C-alpha cells in the first residue's frame, strides 16, 4: 500500500478519505473537534489499508465515535517517533466512544498513552499494555467510564481476561515469539517482523517491521548505499536528493537538518 | 525451498562472450539480491557483481569493464554477460542470494563448470 | 576496493585441537548506524558450495555447530573451532559485505 504524511482531521469528515489507500502514515494522525458527526456516519467508514503510524495517534471531541474498531481494524503499530508530549496515543474527551477496539495494535514502539475523560469508555480495564509498550509506568489512564461490565476464551494475564470487544481478544503469542508476532496456530513470524504476519518465518510475509522496510521486506539495517529514513524505512540517494531539492546525508541516515558541528557538503555533513 | 541454479554454455572459445543463467525459486527477486561469484579450479573466491532487489547493480571493480548483470523478476531468473573471456577465466561461475539487510549471501548454487 | 588478508594460508591439525584464523580488512567493516561488523565466515568443503557460518563478524548461522565462534571489530577479525571435528577439512573464507563483497586468500584446513 502507499505511504501517507501526517493529517489533521478537524471539523468535517470529508478530508479523512485521504487515508483510504494509505497502508502507512509517516507522520501523526489527529481527529479532532467534529461536533456535528454522528454513528450513522460512522457505519460503514473504515480504513482496513491502515496497519502502521510512525508519530502519534490523537483523537479528541469527536462526536458519535463510539469504537474504532470499524475505523482502524488493521492499525497493528505506532512507532512513536514523534511523540505528543511523550504520548504516542492520546483518547481525549472523546464523549461517545465505548471501546477503543484497536483489536489489531500489537506494538506501541516509544512514547506513552493518554486516556483521560471519556465518559462512556469502557473496555480499558481488558486490555493488558504490558504486551504493547516495554514500560506503561507513565500511562495516563483516568476519568473514563471504566461498572462497566466489559464482557469478553480469551488469554489471561496479571488474572485477568483480555479483550478489546465483545467480539475481539486481545491477542497474544508465546514468549518465545517475544515482539515478532505470530499466526493464529501460534507459530513465530519472522524475528524482523513486528507484531504480525501473514505466514510464519518469513519477512517478506510481515504486516509490520522491527527494524526498517526495503523492497517488500523487512531489514535489520539498511546497508550501503541505503539510508535510513524516518527511522522505519531505507531509501537511496536519488529520493534524499529529491526531497532536497523541494534534507542531508549523515550517519547513513537522510535527515532534515545538519546535527551541531556540521554543514553540507554539495549532500553530506561533513564536520 | 529457496534453490538457485546456474545454466552455463560449459565451454566458451577464447575471444568470445559468457551467458549464464541463475534461475531461482523460494523467494523473490524483487526483496533479494543475487551475486556472481567464480572459482579458478583450485583457487580462491572471486566477486564479480551483484543485482539488488531494485534492479541496481555493483561490479568489481578490478573486471567493471567485462561484466553485465540483468534479470527478469516475473520469470525468476538473474542473467550474467561477460565479454572476451580468456583461459584465465577458466573457473566455476556461482549465484547466490544476497539478503541484503541481514545477512551476506547465504543459498548458493552448484555452479557452472566453464572452460576456455 | 578492501582488500581482504586471511592468514595462514595453509595448516595441518588433529580432530580435537583448536584452531584460530586470522581475517585483517584494509578498511574498518564497522557500520556506525548499528555498531556491527559487515563480516561474514564462510565453509567450502571438498567439492561443494561455500556454506555460510557466520554473520555480522560473531553471529552464528541457523544450523552451524557452537565450536565455531567468530569474533573481532573494525579491521582485524578471527575464526575459531573450539575442538575441530574430522568433517571440518575445508576452505575457510572470509568476505566483506560494507560496499560490494571482497573475499579473503581463505585458510586451508588439514587433518592428519
Known amino acids: 500500500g502507499e505511504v501517507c504524511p501526517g493529517m489533521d482531521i478537524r471539523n468535517n469528515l470529508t478530508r479523512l478519505h485521504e487515508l483510504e489507500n494509505c497502508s502507512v502514515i509517516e507522520g501523526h494522525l489527529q481527529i479532532l473537534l467534529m461536533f456535528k458527526t454522528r454513528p450513522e456516519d460512522f457505519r460503514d467508514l473504515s480504513f482496513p489499508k491502515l496497519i502502521m503510524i510512525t508519530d502519534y495517534l490523537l483523537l479528541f471531541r469527536v462526536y458519535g465515535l463510539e469504537s474504532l474498531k470499524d475505523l482502524f481494524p488493521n492499525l497493528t503499530v505506532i512507532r512513536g517517533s514523534r511523540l505528543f508530549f511523550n504520548y504516542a496515543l492520546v483518547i481525549f474527551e472523546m464523549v461517545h466512544l465505548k471501546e477503543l477496539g484497536l483489536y489489531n495494535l500489537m506494538n506501541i514502539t516509544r512514547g506513552s498513552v493518554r486516556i483521560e475523560k471519556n465518559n462512556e469508555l469502557c473496555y480499558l480495564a481488558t486490555i493488558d499494555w504490558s504486551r504493547i509498550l516495554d514500560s506503561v509506568e507513565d500511562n495516563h489512564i483516568v476519568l473514563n467510564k471504566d461498572e462497566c461490565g466489559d464482557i469478553c476464551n480469551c488469554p489471561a494475564t496479571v488474572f485477568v481476561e483480555r479483550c478489546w470487544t465483545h467480539s475481539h481478544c486481545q491477542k497474544v503469542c508465546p514468549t518465545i515469539c517475544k515482539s515478532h508476532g505470530c499466526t493464529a496456530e501460534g507459530l513465530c513470524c519472522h524475528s524482523e517482523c513486528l507484531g504480525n504476519c501473514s505466514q510464519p518465518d518469513d519477512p517478506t510475509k510481515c504486516v509490520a517491521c522491527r527494524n526498517f522496510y526495503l523492497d517488500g521486506r523487512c531489514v535489520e539495517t539498511c546497508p550501503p548505499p541505503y539510508y535510513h529514513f524516518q527511522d522505519w524505512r531505507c531509501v537511496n540517494f536519488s529520493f534524499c536528493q529529491d526531497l532536497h531539492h523541494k534534507y542531508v546525508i549523515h550517519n547513513n541516515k537522510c535527515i532534515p537538518e545538519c546535527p551541531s558541528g556540521y554543514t553540507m557538503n554539495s549532500l553530506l555533513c561533513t564536520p | 525451498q529457496v534453490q538457485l541454479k546456474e545454466s552455463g554454455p560449459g565451454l566458451v572459445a577464447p575471444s568470445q562472450s559468457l551467458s549464464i543463467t541463475c534461475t531461482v525459486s523460494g523467494f523473490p527477486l524483487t526483496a533479494y539480491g543475487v551475486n556472481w561469484v567464480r572459482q579458478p579450479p583450485g583457487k580462491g573466491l572471486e566477486w564479480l557483481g551483484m543485482?539488488?532487489?531494485?534492479?541496481?547493480?555493483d561490479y568489481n571493480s578490478a573486471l567493471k569493464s567485462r561484466l553485465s548483470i540483468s534479470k527478469d523478476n516475473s520469470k525468476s531468473q538473474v542473467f550474467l554477460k561477460m565479454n572476451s573471456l580468456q583461459t584465465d577465466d577458466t573457473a566455476r561461475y556461482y549465484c547466490?542470494?544476497?539478503?541484503?539487510?541481514?545477512?551476506?549471501?547465504?543459498?548458493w548454487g552448484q555452479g557452472t563448470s566453464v572452460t576456455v | 576496493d578492501i582488500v581482504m588478508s586471511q592468514s595462514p594460508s595453509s595448516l595441518v591439525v588433529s580432530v580435537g585441537e583448536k584452531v584460530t584464523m586470522s581475517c585483517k580488512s584494509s578498511q574498518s567493516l564497522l557500520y556506525s548506524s548499528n555498531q556491527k561488523n559487515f563480516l561474514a565466515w564462510y565453509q567450502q568443503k571438498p567439492g561443494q558450495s561455500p556454506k555460510l557460518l557466520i554473520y555480522?563478524?560473531?553471529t552464528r548461522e541457523s544450523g552451524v555447530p557452537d565450536r565455531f565462534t567468530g569474533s573481532g571489530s573494525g579491521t582485524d577479525f578471527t575464526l575459531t573451532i573450539s575442538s575441530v571435528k574430522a568433517e571440518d577439512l575445508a576452505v575457510y573464507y572470509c568476505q566483506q559485505y560494507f560496499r560490494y563483497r571482497t573475499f579473503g586468500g581463505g585458510t586451508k584446513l588439514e587433518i592428519k
Open positions: 543485482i539488488w532487489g531494485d534492479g541496481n547493480t
Open positions: 547466490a542470494r544476497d539478503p541484503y539487510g541481514s545477512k551476506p549471501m547465504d543459498y
Open positions: 555480522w563478524a560473531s
